[PDB]
Design a binder for this molecule. Structure first.
Ligand SMILES: Nc1ncnc2c1ncn2[C@@H]1O[C@H](COP(=O)(O)OP(=O)(O)OP(=O)(O)O)[C@@H](O)[C@H]1O
Ligand SMILES: [Mg+2]
Lengths: 493, 70, 468, 50, 466, 49
């Protein structure tokens, strides 16, 4: 009853006649035969009478008519545990880095209902991405679903990689799911993670463009199952048990494209933009599992960072709007800002985080509220920037200050900033302490200030880090210490 | 009877051995319709496909060893 | 009873029953599923020799063919009465809060009931003050009548709904029902819980007067399809005994999308953009139950999500004819940092009549629409040429329109989490007076930037004086 | 670095070829040994699992 | 094997095979044609009991149902090796040039190979030194990375292709593959044959250093779909030897259109813009074998046709999703006698960042972009008001921009016979330093001339002195 | 050459071929029964390479 035979292989779907007592999402085996040493699996989905349509998780040219199939007795599941840490794996859980077989004691089934409503709590613990603009204007909390939406080559992958890198000592289990990305990009991402040592706590699930459309469709669910296991059971990181995880789904647009291909090859009716009518259900059941559980259900969390690629900055498409409706906030990476030199290109005017504003370190919000206000004033004054010598002292000063703040927000790649450094830099910028610094040299001024604090004043940084949780961050002690530090730096410079 | 079988063994058996394979299957129907094949790749076991059930005992251990070392 | 599963296509389960015991059209059949917990399916079609097609409304991804199905013989029944107050339920009526299950003595009512007849309809309605300038001026929230907000993905539909609940749920004068047919389980629920439990009405919280049925996005299509009907059955008991009910159903479009997915799995011929052929009938069956009758009044407030930004989509197009007050949220207005993001030109209401809302209110609203209609007419002229080419009166109307557009923005008490501006509650009288004064000519000297995220006109004048 | 990478790939390829040859030799030895020991000995063991 | 044709519908045929030995997907069944010639159909589907649906890849006008079908048991076999060099093949690997058959002694590999595994991919990105100043400066290539060119074919695109082939041949291992996907029999085949045979470098013609695969327009959609895979199969043999290969695909959009036509013929549902539902997977089966591996690297420069100039169009969108550098040949630049008519503003590249090409290359490229953007902005001012009204410290920028756009001209080692000027290979570092020294102020006294069809900055200095 | 020499040494029957084949037989086909009945002919002779 556990065995059946293929009767037709077509558009990535086999028919698997006579395989009853198969569950509605069982992973069939296709045991190896002559010419195929390994086994390629399939997902049985349309359990109609006397025929079991199965999506071939892999190239469909490997199997023929008459191939034997054996039902594995399990709903489609991915191996998960501490052994997955530091490994690059297929969506099925098989390794692709070649280091060795994956060690795991338990498997968590993908495609499960999210924990629910009562099993949740408002996010309070912040997530430090390391980008000044993101961490100051779009706060991210643990368990928040923040969307990184841009236009092709704009830096969404770079932002996700920086966020992953910054979670070195934060007790986070980063997961990077590459859906539809070409193998060169995935290899470069893995190499970058390895070089900076972040690969020790990062699990990478790769479903590249050459892979079958069955993959790139279960890959985000495999990553989300891994994140769910981290969130509920937890793993030991740096000698401590961490139940907080961060997952980057990368291109969810390519995931939607892969699901559209799977649906259309199954002759399902198309919907808007030829996508199947349940693409919203796809991404919703994918993203709803990223939750911030309350204490009585373990207190774990799972931050999600889906990435959506737009065409011609068309945010009003189908999939981008679907994901925007699913997620909690957006991070709009405009192409015009990216081309203009503002490499961390953020459309701060429209980027927002509905939740997580209260899930921020009190120091960061206390220093960045007036930052956001001043940026709003600069954006308001962008229309009047064309006029020359027709603006009073107030408007000219506001424009200059906004330019200084934007140049400060410009942060080079692969260089995350600790929270103490970020809050110190913003406190310096927002107290008229940089009005004398010319705009083109603000980046090197920030770099020199950070180097000075790393070398000359570690005690100031430690005090700020220890006093970042206070309700009133600008206590006299930290205020006078950091003011003395900046005065010393300015005198030396 | 109602179902058929596809029992295969490592090597070709004798006529009496066919009867033993037939009579040993009293669990389901006693004596179901059977077909026999050699396929010398099979070693030291039988691959009985009764009804829609398969039981693997030959060539599986050697095959599983490759995945253990590779 | 005691059928067997034939096919399992997605969440649609086809079962075969004996010839003389076929379940009815809307009966609830169950798979034992083992483990002592059962999966409740709802029949949708009858296909022939005892074969029925049912919607799982559950995981339906771990069960095989040939499993037995038990026919309950009744449609899905949910508890109704005061016992449901302050509790959170599934589509099946099973509570999900930490409290215990509902007792057998509580009445169970089928979730598939006929809508009120033509005789029972109550056409009497009056303005329901809400404290939001654009809502209370252009598209008055109608008491005893259906009203809904249509927004895209980035606009703040949830923020508007939460602010509306915070403003009007304290002075309920009756119970209320909340149904997030399709919405984030983060802000749609488990954060409305905190807000409702925090609010206190004379030592009784607002949550003590609320019945909450979710069927969140995570749920399979069946739960999202029938959660609206469950909430309606839970609210019709209170309406039928006279209690005033505030009904907040969130994202009817998710109910439509669940229906579309179920229909696609059911083999029905697709219509328009992949939608179900039975879209209008399903919308009628759900919406016609949301009616204030002669026995009680339901003050419904719905939300509708437009796919992409297409208002020509079949789901919002079907919703539009089932409402008294229509509120349209636009992507461009939200991108202009106007958080209410309501388009006054595309937002109307039935009770915007001088005999109902007041002659001055009607005149003010009509003028605030004629302005911004002139602005929409001159948008292209302004964009390509500039303000100069317009006539003097046209110029004045244009800056008045821009000032009005800025002035419709209003801080919300639920917006403190990402905006530091304190919330404001502007009474409808103050809104009418402020807009009448603005249209008279007062405030012309004030720059447009001073109308952004302010309360009544007095606050704008005070800010202008503060900045001198 | 190039020489080590080419050598490592050759070394891994040699191990896979040797392991496949070793497995094939073990399979042939097992088949002959079972035939000498009698193929009708594990039939009863197979019946036990069924 | 030895099946029989069951159904012939256009180019889609269905062959019935015994219940066993049914051909797999992409198995290239062969139909005898009553003579030495044969018709090769690629199996694309398995239906029912032995029936397989295949695309004819040929005339399929003389066939009859019941005719014998021979299964090859493997995807389309393509001859590979040095024997392919200097020969022209169709998708099936049969040579279409005047020379005789390849012969059985030459290795034949399946057309449907697999992209290099995850470990074999290069972790870092290495710049590909083409030698052309503008290409190496404003839109640098990537070794093992895809590249797109936009042009109307009257802007000397073929000359750029020939220069790239000659440069890689003379300064690297240097084997190139040209994939003529949907290439016209007259305009795109004999013309390119004559240009490649006439063009010579160090006593070796460009034709002798490259292999060309022509999936012509008149061939069925299957041939135009699989000609790119044939070209990759030919190039991967040379990549396996450690050599660096340039693969030129002409109008990859024609490959996309051929895939769409095949999907429509097979009966699959149409994706957005009536494209094949498997657009991403089909574009990933291709253009993923074009990678830089440990052993070798294949770098491709593929022409792209934008449907109705619609870039959002899923065909160019999926093409762009797999691209590293874009080169935009411009008609207006070619109207003036600048053969490397590359538009610096429209042409970009992913590898042009400080972390790979160095800080100096990025700085000089950004400065060139800035000055050329200022010149483009001031074109209208010059046309309307004139040169006099434009202020100081900007007239210098305009003059520098004109001199630098005349500086992108570069003599080509393949066009030395036509123009009577020896070709110059300019290293990327030499290009960067020369352009930095042009920007900083040197050469300002030199007029716009003496920069035209020149190489390094020292060369223009010497020309000015003489 | 170094890889060829190492593989050539490993190609000997008694080097690894006899050790690996016997260990697999004593663990996969049965348990501590590689010899059992007969099977001495294949001991380091059939598994030459
Ligand atoms: N903060 C940054 N500073 C400098 N360069 C950056 C920065 N962020 C990204 N880049 C550069 O932008 C280019 C593209 O970045 P990235 O790899 O993140 O792509 P993307 O915009 O996320 O999308 P895609 O995956 O489609 O290319 C690269 O050359 C990268 O070096
Ligand atoms: Mg990216």
């Amino acid at each position: 009853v556990n065995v059946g035979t293929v009767i037709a292989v077509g558009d990535g779907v086999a028919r698997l006649s006579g395989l009853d007592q198969v569950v509605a999402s069982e992973i069939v085996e296709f045991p190896p035969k002559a010419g195929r040493n390994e086994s390629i699996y399939g997902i049985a989905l349309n359990l109609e009478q006397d025929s079991v349509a199965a999506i071939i998780l892999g190239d469909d040219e490997t199997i023929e008519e008459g191939d034997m199939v054996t039902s594995t007795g399990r709903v489609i599941s991915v191996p998960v545990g501490q052994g997955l840490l530091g490994r690059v794996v297929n969506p099925l859980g098989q390794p692709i880095d070649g280091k060795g077989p994956i060690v795991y004691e338990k498997t968590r089934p993908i495609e499960r209902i999210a924990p629910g409503v009562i099993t949740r709590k408002s996010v309070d613990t912040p997530v430090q991405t390391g980008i000044i603009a993101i961490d100051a204007l779009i706060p991210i909390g643990r368990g928040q679903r923040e969307l990184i939406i841009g236009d092709r080559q704009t830096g969404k992958t770079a932002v996700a990689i920086d966020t992953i890198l910054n979670q070195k000592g934060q007790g986070m289990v980063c997961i990077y799911v590459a859906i539809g990305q070409r193998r060169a990009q995935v290899a470069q991402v893995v190499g970058t993670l390895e070089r900076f040592g972040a690969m020790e706590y990062t699990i990478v699930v790769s479903a590249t463009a050459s892979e079958s459309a069955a993959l790139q469709y279960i890959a985000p669910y495999a990553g989300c199952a891994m994140g769910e296991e981290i969130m509920e059971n937890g793993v030991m990181l740096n000698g401590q048990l961490v139940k907080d995880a961060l997952i980057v789904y990368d291109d969810l647009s390519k995931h939607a494209v892969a699901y559209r291909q799977v649906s259309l090859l199954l002759r399902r009716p198309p919907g808007r933009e030829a996508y199947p009518g349940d693409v919203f259900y796809l991404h919703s059941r994918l993203l709803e599992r990223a939750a911030r559980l309350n204490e009585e259900y373990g207190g774990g969390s799972l931050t999600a960072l889906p990435v959506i690629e737009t065409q011609a900055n068309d945010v009003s498409a189908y999939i981008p709007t679907n994901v925007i409706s699913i997620t909690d906030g957006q991070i709009y990476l405009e192409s015009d800002l990216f081309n203009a030199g503002q490499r961390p290109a953020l459309n701060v005017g429209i980027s927002v985080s509905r939740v997580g504003g209260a899930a921020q370190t009190r120091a960061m919000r206390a220093v960045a509220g007036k930052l956001k206000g001043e940026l709003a004033q600069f954006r308001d004054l962008a229309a009047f920037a064309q006029f020359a010598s027709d603006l009073d002292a107030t408007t000219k000063a506001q424009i200059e200050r906004g330019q200084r703040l934007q140049e400060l927000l410009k942060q080079p790649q692969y260089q995350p900033l600790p929270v103490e450094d970020q809050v110190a830099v913003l406190y310096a910028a927002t107290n008229n302490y940089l009005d004398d610094v010319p705009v083109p040299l603000i980046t090197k001024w920030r770099d020199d200030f950070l180097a000075f604090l790393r070398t000359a004043h570690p005690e100031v940084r430690k005090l700020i880090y220890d006093n970042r949780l206070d309700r009133k961050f600008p206590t006299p002690e930290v205020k006078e210490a950091l003011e003395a530090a900046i005065k010393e730096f300015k005198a030396t410079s | 009877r109602a179902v058929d079988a596809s029992v295969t063994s490592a090597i070709e058996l004798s006529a009496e051995q066919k009867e033993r394979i037939t009579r040993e299957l009293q669990q389901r129907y006693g004596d179901v319709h059977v077909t026999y094949h050699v396929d010398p790749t099979l070693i030291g076991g039988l691959i009985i496909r009764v009804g829609d059930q398969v039981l693997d005992n030959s060539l599986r251990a050697r095959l599983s060893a490759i995945q253990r070392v590779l | 009873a005691k059928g067997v599963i034939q096919e399992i296509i997605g969440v649609v389960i086809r079962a075969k029953f004996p010839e003389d015991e076929v379940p009815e059209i809307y009966n609830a059949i169950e798979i034992p599923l083992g483990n002592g917990d059962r999966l409740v399916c709802e029949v949708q079609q009858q296909l022939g020799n005892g074969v029925v097609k049912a919607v799982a409304m559950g995981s339906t991804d771990g069960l095989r063919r040939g499993l037995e199905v038990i026919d309950t013989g009744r449609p899905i029944a949910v508890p109704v009465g005061p016992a449901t107050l302050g509790r959170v339920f599934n589509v099946l009526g099973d509570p999900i809060d930490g409290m215990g299950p509902i007792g057998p003595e509580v009445e169970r009512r089928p979730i598939h009931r006929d809508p009120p007849s033509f005789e029972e309809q109550n056409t009497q309605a009056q303005i329901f003050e809400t404290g939001i300038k654009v809502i209370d001026l252009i598209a008055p929230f109608t008491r005893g009548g259906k009203t809904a907000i249509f927004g895209g993905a980035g606009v703040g539909k949830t923020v508007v709904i939460q602010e509306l609940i915070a403003n009007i749920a304290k002075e309920q004068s009756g119970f209320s029902v909340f149904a997030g047919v399709g919405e984030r389980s983060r802000e749609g629920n488990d954060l409305i819980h905190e807000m409702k439990e925090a609010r206190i009405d004379e030592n009784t919280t607002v949550f003590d007067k609320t019945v909450m049925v979710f069927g969140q996005m995570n749920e399979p299509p069946g739960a999202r399809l029938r959660v609206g009907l469950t909430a309606l059955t839970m609210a019709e008991y209170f309406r039928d005994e006279g209690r005033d009910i505030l009904l907040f159903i969130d994202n009817i479009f998710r109910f439509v999308q669940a229906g579309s997915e179920v229909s696609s799995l059911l083999g029905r011929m697709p219509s328009q953009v992949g939608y179900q052929p039975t879209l209008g009938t399903e919308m009628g069956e759900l919406q016609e139950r949301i009616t204030s009758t002669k026995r009680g009044s339901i003050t419904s407030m719905q939300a509708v999500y437009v796919p992409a930004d297409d208002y020509t989509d079949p789901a919002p197009a079907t919703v539009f004819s089932h409402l008294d007050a229509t509120i349209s949220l636009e992507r461009s207005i939200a991108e202009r940092a106007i958080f209410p993001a309501v388009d006054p030109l595309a937002s109307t209401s039935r009770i915007l009549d001088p005999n109902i809302v007041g002659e001055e209110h009607y005149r003010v609203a009509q003028e605030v629409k004629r302005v911004l209609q002139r602005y929409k007419d001159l948008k292209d002229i302004i964009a390509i040429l500039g303000m100069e080419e317009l006539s003097d009166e046209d110029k004045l109307t244009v800056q008045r329109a821009r000032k009005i557009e800025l002035f419709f923005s209003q801080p919300f008490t639920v917006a403190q989490q990402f905006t530091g501006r304190p919330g404001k509650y502007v009474p409808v009288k103050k809104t009418v007076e402020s807009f009448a004064r603005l249209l008279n000519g007062e405030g012309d000297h004030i720059p447009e930037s001073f109308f952004y995220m302010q309360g009544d006109f007095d606050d704008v004048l005070a800010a202008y004086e503060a900045s001198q | 670095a190039q020489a080590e990478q080419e050598r490592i790939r050759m070394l891994s390829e040699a191990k896979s070829q040797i392991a496949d040859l070793v497995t094939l030799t073990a399979s042939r030895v097992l088949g002959a040994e079972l035939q000498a020991r009698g193929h009708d000995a594990l039939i009863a063991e197979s019946l036990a699992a069924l």
